[PDB]
Symmetry: C3
Subunit: 195 residues, 3 copies
Protein backbone atom coordinates (compact mmCIF):
# COMPACT_ATOMS: atom_id res chain seq x y z
CA UNK A 1 0.00 0.00 0.00
CA UNK A 2 0.95 3.63 0.59
CA UNK A 3 2.86 5.11 3.50
CA UNK A 4 1.45 7.80 5.74
CA UNK A 5 4.27 9.92 4.38
CA UNK A 6 3.25 9.29 0.78
CA UNK A 7 -0.30 10.34 1.62
CA UNK A 8 1.12 13.62 2.95
CA UNK A 9 3.13 14.22 -0.24
CA UNK A 10 -0.01 13.57 -2.31
CA UNK A 11 -2.13 15.93 -0.20
CA UNK A 12 0.54 18.65 -0.32
CA UNK A 13 0.70 18.42 -4.11
CA UNK A 14 -3.07 18.48 -4.51
CA UNK A 15 -3.36 21.57 -2.30
CA UNK A 16 -0.51 23.26 -4.15
CA UNK A 17 -2.45 22.75 -7.39
CA UNK A 18 -5.74 23.78 -5.75
CA UNK A 19 -4.14 27.11 -4.77
CA UNK A 20 -2.92 27.75 -8.34
CA UNK A 21 -6.32 29.08 -9.43
CA UNK A 22 -7.53 25.41 -9.19
CA UNK A 23 -6.20 24.40 -12.64
CA UNK A 24 -2.63 25.71 -12.75
CA UNK A 25 -2.86 27.63 -16.04
CA UNK A 26 -2.25 31.35 -16.54
CA UNK A 27 -5.47 33.28 -17.32
CA UNK A 28 -5.07 36.07 -19.89
CA UNK A 29 -8.74 37.13 -19.47
CA UNK A 30 -8.23 37.86 -15.76
CA UNK A 31 -9.20 41.47 -15.11
CA UNK A 32 -6.61 42.01 -12.36
CA UNK A 33 -3.94 40.82 -14.81
CA UNK A 34 -4.83 43.63 -17.22
CA UNK A 35 -7.77 42.23 -19.22
CA UNK A 36 -11.04 44.06 -19.84
CA UNK A 37 -14.44 43.59 -21.43
CA UNK A 38 -15.20 45.76 -24.43
CA UNK A 39 -18.56 46.96 -23.10
CA UNK A 40 -19.48 48.28 -26.54
CA UNK A 41 -19.34 44.64 -27.74
CA UNK A 42 -21.29 42.66 -25.12
CA UNK A 43 -24.90 41.62 -24.86
CA UNK A 44 -27.17 43.86 -22.81
CA UNK A 45 -27.01 43.06 -19.11
CA UNK A 46 -30.07 41.41 -17.55
CA UNK A 47 -30.98 41.93 -13.88
CA UNK A 48 -31.77 38.50 -12.39
CA UNK A 49 -33.00 39.95 -9.08
CA UNK A 50 -35.83 42.10 -10.44
CA UNK A 51 -38.37 40.16 -8.36
CA UNK A 52 -36.48 40.87 -5.12
CA UNK A 53 -35.65 44.50 -6.02
CA UNK A 54 -39.33 45.12 -6.84
CA UNK A 55 -40.83 43.60 -3.68
CA UNK A 56 -38.21 44.75 -1.14
CA UNK A 57 -36.46 47.62 -2.94
CA UNK A 58 -33.04 48.66 -4.19
CA UNK A 59 -30.30 48.71 -1.51
CA UNK A 60 -28.14 51.82 -1.23
CA UNK A 61 -25.12 49.63 -2.04
CA UNK A 62 -26.76 47.53 -4.77
CA UNK A 63 -25.55 47.43 -8.38
CA UNK A 64 -26.18 45.15 -11.31
CA UNK A 65 -23.50 42.66 -12.30
CA UNK A 66 -21.76 43.98 -15.43
CA UNK A 67 -19.81 41.96 -18.04
CA UNK A 68 -16.63 42.66 -16.03
CA UNK A 69 -17.83 40.00 -13.58
CA UNK A 70 -16.86 37.16 -15.93
CA UNK A 71 -13.21 38.22 -15.59
CA UNK A 72 -13.35 38.28 -11.78
CA UNK A 73 -12.54 35.25 -9.62
CA UNK A 74 -15.29 35.63 -6.98
CA UNK A 75 -17.83 32.96 -8.05
CA UNK A 76 -20.04 32.80 -4.99
CA UNK A 77 -23.74 32.39 -5.91
CA UNK A 78 -25.00 35.48 -7.72
CA UNK A 79 -21.55 36.77 -8.73
CA UNK A 80 -22.27 36.07 -12.38
CA UNK A 81 -23.11 38.27 -15.37
CA UNK A 82 -26.55 37.56 -16.85
CA UNK A 83 -28.05 38.30 -20.26
CA UNK A 84 -31.61 37.85 -21.47
CA UNK A 85 -32.49 34.57 -23.17
CA UNK A 86 -30.29 31.62 -24.12
CA UNK A 87 -27.98 33.42 -26.63
CA UNK A 88 -25.46 36.10 -25.74
CA UNK A 89 -21.91 37.26 -26.14
CA UNK A 90 -19.01 39.09 -24.54
CA UNK A 91 -15.81 40.34 -26.15
CA UNK A 92 -12.66 40.42 -24.03
CA UNK A 93 -9.42 42.30 -24.61
CA UNK A 94 -6.77 40.00 -23.15
CA UNK A 95 -3.94 41.20 -20.90
CA UNK A 96 -1.43 40.08 -23.55
CA UNK A 97 -1.33 38.95 -27.17
CA UNK A 98 -1.23 35.16 -27.03
CA UNK A 99 -1.61 32.06 -29.09
CA UNK A 100 -4.83 30.74 -27.49
CA UNK A 101 -4.81 27.05 -26.62
CA UNK A 102 -7.71 26.60 -24.19
CA UNK A 103 -10.58 28.28 -22.40
CA UNK A 104 -12.21 27.62 -19.04
CA UNK A 105 -15.84 28.19 -18.12
CA UNK A 106 -17.19 27.66 -14.63
CA UNK A 107 -20.61 27.83 -13.00
CA UNK A 108 -21.88 27.70 -9.42
CA UNK A 109 -21.99 24.10 -8.08
CA UNK A 110 -25.35 22.34 -8.07
CA UNK A 111 -24.95 21.78 -4.32
CA UNK A 112 -25.05 25.56 -3.71
CA UNK A 113 -28.01 26.13 -6.02
CA UNK A 114 -31.73 25.90 -5.15
CA UNK A 115 -33.03 22.38 -5.84
CA UNK A 116 -29.58 21.37 -7.12
CA UNK A 117 -30.31 22.73 -10.59
CA UNK A 118 -28.39 25.25 -12.68
CA UNK A 119 -30.69 25.77 -15.65
CA UNK A 120 -29.27 29.22 -16.33
CA UNK A 121 -25.79 27.79 -16.93
CA UNK A 122 -24.42 28.15 -20.47
CA UNK A 123 -24.58 25.01 -22.59
CA UNK A 124 -23.30 25.28 -26.19
CA UNK A 125 -20.79 28.06 -26.88
CA UNK A 126 -18.09 29.08 -29.34
CA UNK A 127 -14.86 31.09 -29.11
CA UNK A 128 -13.82 33.61 -31.77
CA UNK A 129 -10.50 35.40 -32.20
CA UNK A 130 -10.41 38.92 -33.60
CA UNK A 131 -7.16 39.75 -35.39
CA UNK A 132 -7.72 43.45 -35.98
CA UNK A 133 -9.46 45.44 -33.26
CA UNK A 134 -12.72 46.08 -35.11
CA UNK A 135 -16.07 44.31 -35.05
CA UNK A 136 -14.94 42.26 -38.06
CA UNK A 137 -15.36 38.64 -39.11
CA UNK A 138 -14.23 36.92 -35.96
CA UNK A 139 -12.57 33.63 -36.76
CA UNK A 140 -13.81 30.55 -34.96
CA UNK A 141 -11.26 29.06 -32.59
CA UNK A 142 -13.57 26.28 -31.38
CA UNK A 143 -17.06 25.08 -30.42
CA UNK A 144 -17.79 23.37 -27.07
CA UNK A 145 -20.51 22.44 -24.57
CA UNK A 146 -20.50 23.19 -20.85
CA UNK A 147 -21.77 20.02 -19.17
CA UNK A 148 -24.30 20.75 -16.43
CA UNK A 149 -23.56 17.28 -15.02
CA UNK A 150 -19.78 17.84 -14.95
CA UNK A 151 -17.47 19.54 -12.51
CA UNK A 152 -18.17 23.22 -11.78
CA UNK A 153 -14.93 24.28 -13.53
CA UNK A 154 -14.49 22.91 -17.06
CA UNK A 155 -11.54 23.48 -19.38
CA UNK A 156 -11.79 23.21 -23.19
CA UNK A 157 -8.73 22.75 -25.41
CA UNK A 158 -8.80 23.92 -29.02
CA UNK A 159 -8.30 21.14 -31.54
CA UNK A 160 -5.30 21.84 -33.79
CA UNK A 161 -5.24 25.61 -33.16
CA UNK A 162 -3.30 27.84 -35.49
CA UNK A 163 -0.03 29.43 -34.49
CA UNK A 164 -2.08 32.62 -34.83
CA UNK A 165 -2.06 35.08 -31.92
CA UNK A 166 -4.87 37.29 -30.66
CA UNK A 167 -5.50 39.88 -27.97
CA UNK A 168 -9.29 40.04 -28.52
CA UNK A 169 -11.57 37.01 -28.21
CA UNK A 170 -15.35 36.61 -28.07
CA UNK A 171 -17.29 34.20 -25.87
CA UNK A 172 -20.51 33.46 -27.78
CA UNK A 173 -23.21 31.59 -25.84
CA UNK A 174 -25.52 29.75 -28.23
CA UNK A 175 -27.69 27.68 -25.88
CA UNK A 176 -28.27 27.43 -22.15
CA UNK A 177 -29.40 24.63 -19.88
CA UNK A 178 -33.09 25.49 -20.26
CA UNK A 179 -33.73 28.59 -18.15
CA UNK A 180 -36.45 30.32 -20.19
CA UNK A 181 -35.52 33.89 -19.23
CA UNK A 182 -31.74 34.33 -18.94
CA UNK A 183 -28.27 32.82 -18.94
CA UNK A 184 -25.54 33.79 -16.50
CA UNK A 185 -21.79 33.42 -16.65
CA UNK A 186 -19.72 33.10 -13.49
CA UNK A 187 -16.19 33.19 -14.91
CA UNK A 188 -14.47 32.88 -18.29
CA UNK A 189 -10.72 32.27 -18.66
CA UNK A 190 -8.43 32.25 -21.68
CA UNK A 191 -5.19 30.24 -21.75
CA UNK A 192 -2.38 30.13 -24.27
CA UNK A 193 1.21 30.99 -25.04
CA UNK A 194 2.45 34.60 -25.10
CA UNK A 195 5.72 35.94 -26.53
CA UNK B 1 -4.43 -0.91 2.80
CA UNK B 2 -5.32 1.81 0.30
CA UNK B 3 -3.94 2.34 -3.18
CA UNK B 4 -2.19 5.51 -4.25
CA UNK B 5 -5.09 5.87 -6.65
CA UNK B 6 -7.66 5.59 -3.88
CA UNK B 7 -5.85 8.32 -1.95
CA UNK B 8 -6.17 10.54 -5.03
CA UNK B 9 -9.91 9.87 -5.31
CA UNK B 10 -10.32 10.73 -1.61
CA UNK B 11 -8.32 13.95 -1.93
CA UNK B 12 -10.24 14.98 -5.06
CA UNK B 13 -13.56 14.47 -3.28
CA UNK B 14 -12.46 16.35 -0.17
CA UNK B 15 -11.30 19.31 -2.26
CA UNK B 16 -14.50 19.26 -4.28
CA UNK B 17 -16.44 19.57 -1.01
CA UNK B 18 -14.01 22.19 0.34
CA UNK B 19 -14.73 24.35 -2.73
CA UNK B 20 -18.52 24.08 -2.23
CA UNK B 21 -18.53 26.84 0.40
CA UNK B 22 -16.80 24.26 2.72
CA UNK B 23 -20.05 22.51 3.75
CA UNK B 24 -21.91 21.88 0.48
CA UNK B 25 -25.25 23.46 1.46
CA UNK B 26 -26.99 26.35 -0.29
CA UNK B 27 -26.97 29.56 1.80
CA UNK B 28 -30.17 31.62 1.58
CA UNK B 29 -28.68 34.38 3.81
CA UNK B 30 -25.84 34.99 1.34
CA UNK B 31 -25.92 38.65 0.31
CA UNK B 32 -24.67 38.02 -3.24
CA UNK B 33 -27.52 35.51 -3.66
CA UNK B 34 -30.08 38.23 -2.95
CA UNK B 35 -30.29 38.33 0.86
CA UNK B 36 -30.09 41.50 2.96
CA UNK B 37 -30.01 42.67 6.56
CA UNK B 38 -32.97 44.73 7.70
CA UNK B 39 -30.84 47.52 9.18
CA UNK B 40 -33.87 48.89 11.02
CA UNK B 41 -33.94 45.59 12.96
CA UNK B 42 -30.32 45.00 14.03
CA UNK B 43 -28.39 45.90 17.14
CA UNK B 44 -26.35 49.09 17.01
CA UNK B 45 -22.95 48.55 15.44
CA UNK B 46 -19.91 48.73 17.74
CA UNK B 47 -16.50 49.86 16.49
CA UNK B 48 -13.91 47.37 17.79
CA UNK B 49 -10.94 49.45 16.57
CA UNK B 50 -11.65 52.62 18.55
CA UNK B 51 -8.28 52.32 20.32
CA UNK B 52 -6.38 52.21 17.01
CA UNK B 53 -8.52 54.90 15.32
CA UNK B 54 -7.99 57.20 18.32
CA UNK B 55 -4.21 56.82 18.59
CA UNK B 56 -3.33 56.68 14.87
CA UNK B 57 -6.41 58.20 13.20
CA UNK B 58 -9.12 57.33 10.72
CA UNK B 59 -7.87 56.19 7.29
CA UNK B 60 -9.35 57.85 4.20
CA UNK B 61 -10.61 54.40 3.13
CA UNK B 62 -11.76 53.22 6.57
CA UNK B 63 -15.36 52.31 7.40
CA UNK B 64 -17.04 50.45 10.21
CA UNK B 65 -18.23 46.91 9.62
CA UNK B 66 -22.03 46.99 9.22
CA UNK B 67 -24.49 44.12 9.78
CA UNK B 68 -24.17 43.28 6.06
CA UNK B 69 -20.80 41.72 6.90
CA UNK B 70 -22.43 38.64 8.43
CA UNK B 71 -23.85 37.77 4.99
CA UNK B 72 -20.48 38.14 3.25
CA UNK B 73 -18.04 35.25 2.82
CA UNK B 74 -14.76 37.10 3.54
CA UNK B 75 -13.95 35.97 7.11
CA UNK B 76 -10.36 37.11 7.43
CA UNK B 77 -9.61 38.52 10.93
CA UNK B 78 -11.59 41.71 11.52
CA UNK B 79 -14.18 41.06 8.78
CA UNK B 80 -16.90 40.58 11.37
CA UNK B 81 -19.81 42.71 12.57
CA UNK B 82 -19.58 43.69 16.24
CA UNK B 83 -22.18 44.85 18.73
CA UNK B 84 -21.73 46.15 22.27
CA UNK B 85 -21.94 43.63 25.10
CA UNK B 86 -22.79 39.92 25.05
CA UNK B 87 -26.40 40.18 23.72
CA UNK B 88 -27.36 41.33 20.24
CA UNK B 89 -29.43 40.56 17.20
CA UNK B 90 -29.67 40.82 13.43
CA UNK B 91 -32.69 40.22 11.20
CA UNK B 92 -32.08 38.87 7.70
CA UNK B 93 -34.39 38.87 4.69
CA UNK B 94 -33.49 35.66 2.87
CA UNK B 95 -32.96 35.45 -0.90
CA UNK B 96 -35.94 33.07 -1.12
CA UNK B 97 -38.82 31.82 0.99
CA UNK B 98 -37.66 28.48 2.38
CA UNK B 99 -38.43 25.85 4.93
CA UNK B 100 -35.40 26.39 7.20
CA UNK B 101 -33.59 23.24 8.28
CA UNK B 102 -30.21 24.43 9.55
CA UNK B 103 -28.00 27.42 10.25
CA UNK B 104 -24.24 27.86 10.17
CA UNK B 105 -22.17 30.20 12.33
CA UNK B 106 -18.45 30.63 11.92
CA UNK B 107 -15.74 32.57 13.74
CA UNK B 108 -12.07 33.31 13.06
CA UNK B 109 -9.82 30.33 13.97
CA UNK B 110 -8.01 30.46 17.30
CA UNK B 111 -4.72 30.01 15.42
CA UNK B 112 -5.22 33.38 13.66
CA UNK B 113 -6.26 35.19 16.85
CA UNK B 114 -3.99 36.88 19.41
CA UNK B 115 -3.08 34.42 22.19
CA UNK B 116 -5.25 31.76 20.53
CA UNK B 117 -8.39 33.08 22.20
CA UNK B 118 -11.69 34.19 20.69
CA UNK B 119 -13.54 35.58 23.69
CA UNK B 120 -15.68 37.83 21.50
CA UNK B 121 -17.15 34.84 19.66
CA UNK B 122 -20.88 34.25 20.14
CA UNK B 123 -21.79 31.47 22.56
CA UNK B 124 -25.51 30.84 23.17
CA UNK B 125 -27.88 31.97 20.42
CA UNK B 126 -31.38 31.36 19.08
CA UNK B 127 -33.01 31.54 15.65
CA UNK B 128 -36.47 33.04 15.08
CA UNK B 129 -38.65 32.93 11.97
CA UNK B 130 -40.91 35.85 11.14
CA UNK B 131 -43.98 34.86 9.13
CA UNK B 132 -45.34 38.30 8.34
CA UNK B 133 -42.84 41.06 7.59
CA UNK B 134 -43.38 43.11 10.75
CA UNK B 135 -41.51 43.23 14.05
CA UNK B 136 -44.00 40.70 15.44
CA UNK B 137 -43.73 37.70 17.74
CA UNK B 138 -40.92 35.85 16.06
CA UNK B 139 -41.32 32.12 16.49
CA UNK B 140 -38.39 30.18 17.84
CA UNK B 141 -36.88 27.78 15.34
CA UNK B 142 -34.13 26.58 17.67
CA UNK B 143 -31.59 27.33 20.42
CA UNK B 144 -27.88 26.41 20.09
CA UNK B 145 -24.37 27.10 21.38
CA UNK B 146 -21.32 27.99 19.29
CA UNK B 147 -18.45 25.97 20.77
CA UNK B 148 -15.28 28.03 21.13
CA UNK B 149 -13.35 24.74 21.29
CA UNK B 150 -14.91 23.37 18.09
CA UNK B 151 -14.16 23.86 14.43
CA UNK B 152 -14.30 27.45 13.13
CA UNK B 153 -17.40 26.65 11.01
CA UNK B 154 -20.27 25.03 12.92
CA UNK B 155 -23.62 23.92 11.50
CA UNK B 156 -26.77 23.56 13.62
CA UNK B 157 -29.78 21.51 12.50
CA UNK B 158 -33.25 22.33 13.80
CA UNK B 159 -34.86 19.51 15.75
CA UNK B 160 -38.20 18.49 14.20
CA UNK B 161 -38.74 21.78 12.33
CA UNK B 162 -42.17 22.61 11.02
CA UNK B 163 -43.02 22.44 7.35
CA UNK B 164 -43.43 26.20 7.81
CA UNK B 165 -41.60 28.51 5.41
CA UNK B 166 -40.03 31.89 6.09
CA UNK B 167 -38.17 34.62 4.24
CA UNK B 168 -37.22 36.59 7.38
CA UNK B 169 -35.19 35.11 10.24
CA UNK B 170 -33.49 36.64 13.28
CA UNK B 171 -30.11 35.64 14.71
CA UNK B 172 -30.32 36.46 18.44
CA UNK B 173 -27.04 36.29 20.37
CA UNK B 174 -27.71 35.68 24.06
CA UNK B 175 -24.22 35.11 25.47
CA UNK B 176 -20.65 35.42 24.23
CA UNK B 177 -17.43 33.69 25.17
CA UNK B 178 -16.56 36.23 27.87
CA UNK B 179 -15.36 39.37 26.09
CA UNK B 180 -16.58 42.08 28.49
CA UNK B 181 -17.12 44.78 25.86
CA UNK B 182 -18.46 43.31 22.60
CA UNK B 183 -19.38 40.30 20.51
CA UNK B 184 -18.58 39.95 16.82
CA UNK B 185 -20.07 37.77 14.12
CA UNK B 186 -18.02 36.67 11.13
CA UNK B 187 -20.66 34.92 9.03
CA UNK B 188 -24.21 33.59 9.43
CA UNK B 189 -25.81 31.19 6.94
CA UNK B 190 -29.34 29.84 6.61
CA UNK B 191 -30.09 26.51 4.94
CA UNK B 192 -33.36 24.86 4.01
CA UNK B 193 -35.68 23.79 1.23
CA UNK B 194 -37.24 26.30 -1.17
CA UNK B 195 -40.15 25.76 -3.58
CA UNK C 1 0.01 0.66 5.27
CA UNK C 2 -2.61 3.30 6.05
CA UNK C 3 -6.35 2.86 6.43
CA UNK C 4 -8.86 4.68 4.30
CA UNK C 5 -9.95 6.27 7.55
CA UNK C 6 -6.44 7.47 8.34
CA UNK C 7 -6.24 9.06 4.90
CA UNK C 8 -9.44 10.96 5.72
CA UNK C 9 -8.04 12.21 9.03
CA UNK C 10 -4.88 13.39 7.23
CA UNK C 11 -6.86 15.17 4.52
CA UNK C 12 -9.15 16.82 7.09
CA UNK C 13 -6.15 18.12 9.03
CA UNK C 14 -4.39 19.41 5.92
CA UNK C 15 -7.52 21.27 4.81
CA UNK C 16 -8.03 22.68 8.29
CA UNK C 17 -4.50 24.11 8.11
CA UNK C 18 -5.01 25.28 4.51
CA UNK C 19 -8.03 27.31 5.66
CA UNK C 20 -6.04 28.97 8.48
CA UNK C 21 -4.52 31.54 6.10
CA UNK C 22 -2.43 28.60 4.70
CA UNK C 23 0.23 28.75 7.44
CA UNK C 24 -1.72 28.91 10.71
CA UNK C 25 -0.02 31.99 12.21
CA UNK C 26 -1.70 35.24 13.21
CA UNK C 27 -0.80 38.15 10.89
CA UNK C 28 -0.33 41.50 12.65
CA UNK C 29 0.26 43.30 9.31
CA UNK C 30 -3.19 42.28 8.02
CA UNK C 31 -5.10 45.43 7.09
CA UNK C 32 -8.52 44.03 8.08
CA UNK C 33 -7.06 43.24 11.51
CA UNK C 34 -6.22 46.90 12.07
CA UNK C 35 -2.83 47.34 10.36
CA UNK C 36 -1.98 50.12 7.91
CA UNK C 37 0.82 51.33 5.66
CA UNK C 38 2.38 54.65 6.57
CA UNK C 39 2.05 56.11 3.07
CA UNK C 40 4.44 58.92 3.99
CA UNK C 41 7.11 56.20 4.46
CA UNK C 42 6.81 53.97 1.37
CA UNK C 43 8.53 54.00 -1.99
CA UNK C 44 6.71 55.76 -4.80
CA UNK C 45 4.17 53.51 -6.49
CA UNK C 46 4.95 52.32 -10.02
CA UNK C 47 2.20 51.54 -12.54
CA UNK C 48 3.04 48.19 -14.17
CA UNK C 49 0.22 48.45 -16.74
CA UNK C 50 1.33 51.67 -18.42
CA UNK C 51 1.65 49.87 -21.77
CA UNK C 52 -1.95 48.63 -21.61
CA UNK C 53 -3.37 51.91 -20.23
CA UNK C 54 -1.60 53.83 -23.02
CA UNK C 55 -2.73 51.65 -25.94
CA UNK C 56 -6.30 50.86 -24.79
CA UNK C 57 -6.99 53.59 -22.21
CA UNK C 58 -7.86 54.02 -18.56
CA UNK C 59 -11.03 52.19 -17.43
CA UNK C 60 -13.62 54.17 -15.48
CA UNK C 61 -13.09 51.73 -12.58
CA UNK C 62 -9.29 51.48 -12.85
CA UNK C 63 -6.90 52.53 -10.07
CA UNK C 64 -3.25 51.92 -9.36
CA UNK C 65 -2.30 49.39 -6.70
CA UNK C 66 -1.19 51.31 -3.59
CA UNK C 67 1.07 50.07 -0.77
CA UNK C 68 -2.07 48.95 1.10
CA UNK C 69 -2.20 45.99 -1.29
CA UNK C 70 0.65 44.21 0.50
CA UNK C 71 -1.56 43.94 3.60
CA UNK C 72 -4.50 42.48 1.66
CA UNK C 73 -5.00 38.75 1.14
CA UNK C 74 -6.17 38.78 -2.50
CA UNK C 75 -3.03 37.63 -4.38
CA UNK C 76 -4.48 36.88 -7.79
CA UNK C 77 -2.12 37.95 -10.63
CA UNK C 78 -1.74 41.73 -10.67
CA UNK C 79 -2.94 42.27 -7.07
CA UNK C 80 0.52 43.35 -6.00
CA UNK C 81 2.10 46.72 -5.17
CA UNK C 82 4.94 47.69 -7.52
CA UNK C 83 7.81 50.14 -7.15
CA UNK C 84 10.36 51.27 -9.72
CA UNK C 85 13.64 49.37 -9.89
CA UNK C 86 14.98 46.56 -7.69
CA UNK C 87 15.15 48.49 -4.36
CA UNK C 88 12.15 49.73 -2.41
CA UNK C 89 10.51 49.89 0.97
CA UNK C 90 7.23 49.99 2.86
CA UNK C 91 6.62 50.82 6.51
CA UNK C 92 3.71 49.12 8.27
CA UNK C 93 1.97 50.07 11.50
CA UNK C 94 0.94 46.73 12.97
CA UNK C 95 -2.51 46.04 14.45
CA UNK C 96 -0.86 45.43 17.84
CA UNK C 97 2.46 45.90 19.59
CA UNK C 98 4.18 42.52 19.37
CA UNK C 99 7.47 40.78 19.83
CA UNK C 100 8.13 39.90 16.16
CA UNK C 101 9.26 36.34 15.52
CA UNK C 102 8.72 35.79 11.79
CA UNK C 103 7.62 37.34 8.53
CA UNK C 104 5.96 35.86 5.46
CA UNK C 105 6.37 37.02 1.87
CA UNK C 106 4.45 35.52 -1.02
CA UNK C 107 4.43 35.99 -4.78
CA UNK C 108 2.20 34.78 -7.61
CA UNK C 109 2.98 31.15 -8.58
CA UNK C 110 5.15 30.57 -11.64
CA UNK C 111 2.35 28.44 -13.11
CA UNK C 112 0.04 31.50 -13.26
CA UNK C 113 2.72 33.79 -14.71
CA UNK C 114 3.60 34.30 -18.40
CA UNK C 115 6.38 31.89 -19.43
CA UNK C 116 6.53 30.54 -15.86
CA UNK C 117 8.84 33.35 -14.75
CA UNK C 118 8.48 35.84 -11.91
CA UNK C 119 11.43 38.15 -12.47
CA UNK C 120 9.71 41.02 -10.68
CA UNK C 121 9.52 39.03 -7.44
CA UNK C 122 11.56 40.39 -4.52
CA UNK C 123 14.83 38.58 -3.85
CA UNK C 124 16.99 39.91 -0.98
CA UNK C 125 15.18 41.88 1.72
CA UNK C 126 15.55 43.00 5.33
CA UNK C 127 13.12 43.73 8.17
CA UNK C 128 13.54 46.70 10.52
CA UNK C 129 11.70 47.48 13.74
CA UNK C 130 11.01 51.08 14.72
CA UNK C 131 10.74 51.60 18.47
CA UNK C 132 9.59 55.21 18.51
CA UNK C 133 7.18 56.33 15.80
CA UNK C 134 9.56 58.57 13.87
CA UNK C 135 11.69 57.96 10.79
CA UNK C 136 14.60 57.08 13.10
CA UNK C 137 17.37 54.49 13.00
CA UNK C 138 15.33 51.39 12.37
CA UNK C 139 16.93 48.38 14.00
CA UNK C 140 17.52 45.34 11.86
CA UNK C 141 15.43 42.35 12.86
CA UNK C 142 16.75 40.11 10.08
CA UNK C 143 17.95 39.67 6.49
CA UNK C 144 16.48 37.03 4.14
CA UNK C 145 16.05 35.98 0.50
CA UNK C 146 12.78 35.13 -1.23
CA UNK C 147 13.53 32.05 -3.35
CA UNK C 148 12.03 32.29 -6.82
CA UNK C 149 12.35 28.49 -7.07
CA UNK C 150 10.55 27.88 -3.76
CA UNK C 151 6.91 27.69 -2.79
CA UNK C 152 4.80 30.79 -3.52
CA UNK C 153 4.38 31.50 0.22
CA UNK C 154 7.63 31.62 2.21
CA UNK C 155 8.01 32.22 5.94
CA UNK C 156 11.20 33.60 7.52
CA UNK C 157 11.97 33.24 11.23
CA UNK C 158 14.22 35.74 12.98
CA UNK C 159 17.37 34.21 14.45
CA UNK C 160 17.60 34.87 18.20
CA UNK C 161 15.23 37.87 18.18
CA UNK C 162 15.18 40.20 21.14
CA UNK C 163 12.35 40.24 23.63
CA UNK C 164 11.84 43.73 22.20
CA UNK C 165 8.36 44.68 20.98
CA UNK C 166 7.38 46.88 18.05
CA UNK C 167 4.26 48.22 16.38
CA UNK C 168 6.08 49.66 13.34
CA UNK C 169 8.21 47.56 11.00
CA UNK C 170 9.78 48.24 7.60
CA UNK C 171 10.01 45.80 4.69
CA UNK C 172 13.11 46.85 2.74
CA UNK C 173 13.58 45.21 -0.67
CA UNK C 174 17.24 45.25 -1.67
CA UNK C 175 17.29 43.12 -4.83
CA UNK C 176 14.72 41.55 -7.14
CA UNK C 177 14.78 38.52 -9.39
CA UNK C 178 16.08 40.47 -12.39
CA UNK C 179 13.16 42.49 -13.75
CA UNK C 180 14.96 45.59 -15.06
CA UNK C 181 12.10 48.04 -14.47
CA UNK C 182 10.18 47.22 -11.27
CA UNK C 183 9.57 44.92 -8.33
CA UNK C 184 6.13 43.98 -7.05
CA UNK C 185 4.97 42.66 -3.71
CA UNK C 186 1.87 40.51 -3.43
CA UNK C 187 1.56 40.15 0.35
CA UNK C 188 3.66 40.77 3.46
CA UNK C 189 2.79 39.32 6.87
CA UNK C 190 4.26 39.87 10.32
CA UNK C 191 4.05 37.24 13.07
CA UNK C 192 4.97 37.36 16.72
CA UNK C 193 3.75 37.40 20.29
CA UNK C 194 1.53 40.20 21.64
CA UNK C 195 0.71 41.01 25.27
K1 LIG D 1 -17.27 36.20 -11.24
K1 LIG E 1 -17.88 38.30 6.89
K1 LIG F 1 -2.37 41.58 -2.17
Amino acid sequence: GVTEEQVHHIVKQALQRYSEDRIGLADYALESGGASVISTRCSETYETKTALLSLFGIPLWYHSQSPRVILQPDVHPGNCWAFQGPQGFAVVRLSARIRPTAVTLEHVPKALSPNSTISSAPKDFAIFGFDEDLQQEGTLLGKFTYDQDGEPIQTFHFQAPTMATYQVVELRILTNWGHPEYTCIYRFRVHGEPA
